Swiss-Prot record, chain A:
The lineage of its organism: Eukaryota, Metazoa, Chordata, Craniata, Vertebrata. The modification Phosphoserine is found at S168, S174. This is Complement C3 beta chain. The chain holds residues 130 to 343 of 1663 of the full protein.
Length: 214, 614
């Protein structure tokens, strides 16, 4: 069961439109009965339904209107065939307070890694283009941190404002900052841990702000 | 609340059929009971999937051999020439009744054997008589001993008949009468029984038909040694089989207060079967273990049916919770908060939780948290604007964005912005700096740090060039870069203290009245005819005769006690006439003119002038 939701983020008071494809092991349409349960962020079902794929060619369009007073965070939609209730397929859609942004921010480092003995430091390029294909002028804040396991620690001496002209700016994290931010002076013992770049961009109009994290 | 069964790892030693009828029984009984136990416990995944087919083949071969060995009178014996043995026939009946599930057995053979036994093998008193003892009686269990042997044989044959009673219930109608006679005979002389094996078998025979009541249960319970088993002096195999029949009797009676100790004693006994003269005990113990499974004593008793008495009383909402729905969470949504009655019925236990969600009034929670903005403007067209910030936290602030959004037709003085950008810890984007001029009504200032102990703040001049009245109040907004939901906002207006616009609000129904109080008429046009003619415009709705009675003040407005005399021209309201009326006016309107009590006034207005609720 391959569940497809039109959007990937919904606001409360907005309807959810999703489909439930029904295919067999050989990837062909099949006529079977499905069950669907839509879970809260905590994991308590809110809606239950039963449908048949017979004479529907393996597509079951459905709907749900999100209640106004609901919890935030990830929601889940779990669907499973009626004959085999112990195998369950799922997708996640997020309910959040948002207004659509105006431009996408892309941060791609020059190399998809950081050599530990490199004396030049991490080389990250921040680029910002409007949604419909025009370049952005603004100021971008960035920050770096060390992500080990599940705990994220940021580098206080690393946040920088690098103004972007013609929609591209470049900042470098000098290895001295990386070594001094962490409490282990042994550079070799730092291996394995992953950096993470959090870039915040604001236009010179100051009307819109967007965050992008790599 | 259950005991794990044997893993059957060491039960591999459980023999091809061979020999005569007795030897074939010796061969089949352990293998048949072992495969039945494995089927019941569903442990074939580890014992070896392949061996079951060989077991079935060998047991089928033995069954076919014994079908060939069946006497024409449906009798089973060691030899066809030898006289049939009642015990052998009963054992064959039991084996067939056990193996009908695994292999095909002719029910006609069983019915014929039952009829043959009933016809001449029993006394009218209900005593089962053995006409030919088996040649090899060393493996018949407790029946070898002659003390109370007749009662033991009676109980064994009665159990064999009753377990096959349903199979030949239609063919044989005299079986229930013989069963009742045997039970009466067994219960007549129960007190004479002394051996634990004989007592157990007699009690099982009595319980399988339904006369185990009264002091018999007390005697059986008091007969227990250490409350785990019924033992007798001699071979321990007799004790094992006696405990087996005891636990079958308990399971038939469904007495859960004694099964766990018995099964624990059996488990710690570690009887793997085999040996010499242990066929009956092994068969009984493995049949006991198999019957324990698929009827495991546990606490599955969840059949709750819960109904809700909704306050709306539209209908009755009920739902049922079963074992298959023990993890089924049903959510009920109600839009009304009122007491409702819940009824819980059925065996089992359930959980109820109710949660309500709503909006709570703010407990003096302010929008500008953890910042302190104090935006001021003052005349020096020049205006010196100075924005003073602070951080309410315990530490020095991170990088913050001091945003500015100018009014209508006001621009920053480009001379000051140069040294502001040049200064320390205040950076203004080059793009915003180079354009400037009349084109910019929006300036953004980045702060390196915001002091959390003192107030370091800036001040630069803004000019005017468009000269338009009715200026829009500006804005100032600060926020640390790491988030946007936590910020602050202040509005600066040259004349209004905070530029919040005039908003006459009562209780919580706010509305704005951005207009003049009245016309500043100096009575220059004494010709009231023109005013009367102009008053007939569509923008005029009601004209009233009013006389002020009392004058009162309030927080941000002043109220006057009107005395209506007559409604000159409609009003889209009740005329009333002669009752006190209240007029709500802005507090600024007192300066423009103050109404005098006990004076006649003329006023005309439109529909929106009547504000409030009737």
């Amino acid at each position: 069961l391959f569940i497809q939701t039109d959007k990937t983020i919904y606001t409360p008071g907005s309807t959810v439109l999703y489909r439930i494809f029904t295919v067999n092991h050989k990837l062909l349409p099949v006529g079977r009965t499905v069950m669907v349960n839509i879970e809260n962020p905590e994991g308590i079902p809110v809606k239950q339904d039963s449908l048949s794929s017979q004479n529907q060619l393996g597509v079951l369009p459905l709907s749900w209107d999100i209640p106004e007073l609901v919890n935030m965070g990830q929601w889940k939609i779990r669907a499973y065939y009626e004959n085999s209730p112990q195998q369950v397929f799922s997708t996640e859609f997020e309910v959040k307070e948002y207004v659509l942004p105006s431009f996408e921010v892309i941060v791609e480092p020059t190399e998809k890694f950081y050599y530990i003995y490199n004396e030049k430091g991490l080389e990250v390029t921040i680029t910002a283009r409007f949604l419909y294909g025009k370049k952005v002028e603004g100021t971008a804040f960035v920050i770096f941190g060390i992500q080990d396991g599940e705990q994220r620690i940021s580098l206080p001496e690393s946040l920088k404002r690098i103004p972007i002209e013609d929609g591209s700016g470049e900042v470098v994290l000098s290895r001295k900052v990386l070594l001094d931010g962490v409490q282990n002076p042994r550079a070799e013992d730092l291996v394995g841990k992953s950096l993470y770049v959090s870039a915040t961009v604001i236009l010179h109009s100051g009307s819109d702000m967007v965050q992008a994290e790599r | 609340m259950t005991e794990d069964a044997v893993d059957a790892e060491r039960l591999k030693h459980l023999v091809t059929p061979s020999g005569c009828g007795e030897q074939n029984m010796i061969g089949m009984t352990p293998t048949v009971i072992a495969v039945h136990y494995l089927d019941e416990t569903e442990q074939w995944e580890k014992f070896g999937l392949e061996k079951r087919q060989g077991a079935l083949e060998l047991i089928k071969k033995g069954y076919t051999q014994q079908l060939a060995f069946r006497q024409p009178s449906s009798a089973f014996a060691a030899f066809v020439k030898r006289a049939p043995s009642t015990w052998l026939t009963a054992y064959v009946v039991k084996v067939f009744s056990l193996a009908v599930n695994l292999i095909a057995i002719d029910s006609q053979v069983l019915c014929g054997a039952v009829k043959w036994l009933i016809l001449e093998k029993q006394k009218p008193d209900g005593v089962f008589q053995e006409d030919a003892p088996v040649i090899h009686q060393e493996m018949i269990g407790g029946l070898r001993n002659n003390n109370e042997k007749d009662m033991a044989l009676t109980a064994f044959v009665l159990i064999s008949l009753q377990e096959a009673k349903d199979i030949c219930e239609e063919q044989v109608n005299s079986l229930p009468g013989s069963i009742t006679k045997a039970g009466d005979f067994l219960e007549a002389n129960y007190m004479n029984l002394q051996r634990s094996y004989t007592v157990a078998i007699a009690g099982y025979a009595l319980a399988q038909m339904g006369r185990l009541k009264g002091p018999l249960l007390n005697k059986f319970l008091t007969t227990a040694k250490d409350k785990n088993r019924w033992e007798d002096p001699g071979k321990q195999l007799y004790n094992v089989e006696a405990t087996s029949y005891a636990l079958l009797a308990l399971l038939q009676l469904k007495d859960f207060d004694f099964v766990p100790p018995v099964v624990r004693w059996l488990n710690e006994q570690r009887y793997y079967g085999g040996g010499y003269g242990s066929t009956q005990a092994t068969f009984m113990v493995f049949q006991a273990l198999a019957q324990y499974q698929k009827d495991a004593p546990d606490h599955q008793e969840l059949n709750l049916d819960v109904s809700l008495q909704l306050p709306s009383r539209s209908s009755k909402i009920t739902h049922r919770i079963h074992w298959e729905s023990a993890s089924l969470l049903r959510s009920e949504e109600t839009k009304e908060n009122e007491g409702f009655t819940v009824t819980a019925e059925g065996k089992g236990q359930g959980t109820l939780s109710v949660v309500t969600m709503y909006h709570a009034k703010a407990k003096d929670q302010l929008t500008c948290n953890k910042f302190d903005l104090k935006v001021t403007i003052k005349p020096a067209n020049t205006m010196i604007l100075e924005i003073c910030t602070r951080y309410r936290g315990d530490q020095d602030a991170t990088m913050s964005i001091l945003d500015i959004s100018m009014m209508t037709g006001f621009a920053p003085d480009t001379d000051d912005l140069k040294q502001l950008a040049n200064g320390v810890d205040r950076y203004i984007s080059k793009y915003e700096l180079d354009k400037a001029f009349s084109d910019r009504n929006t300036l953004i200032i980045y702060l390196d740090k915001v002091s959390h102990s003192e107030d370091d703040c800036l001040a630069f001049k803004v000019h005017q060039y468009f000269n338009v009245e009715l200026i829009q109040p500006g804005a100032v907004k600060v926020y640390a870069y790491y988030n946007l939901e936590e910020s602050c906002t202040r509005f600066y207006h040259p004349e209004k203290e905070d530029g919040k616009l005039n908003k006459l609000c009562r209780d919580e129904l706010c509305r704005c009245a951005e207009e003049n109080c009245f016309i500043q008429k100096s009575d220059d046009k004494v010709t009231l005819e023109e005013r009367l003619d102009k008053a007939c415009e569509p923008g005029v709705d009601y004209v009233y005769k009013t006389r002020l009675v009392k004058v009162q003040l309030s927080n941000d407005f002043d109220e006057y006690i009107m005395a209506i005399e007559q409604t000159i021209k409609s009003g889209s309201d009740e005329v009333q006439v002669g009752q006190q009326r209240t007029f709500i006016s802005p507090i600024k309107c007192r300066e423009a003119l103050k109404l005098e009590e006990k004076k006649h006034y003329l006023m005309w207005g439109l529909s929106s002038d009547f504000w409030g609720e009737k």
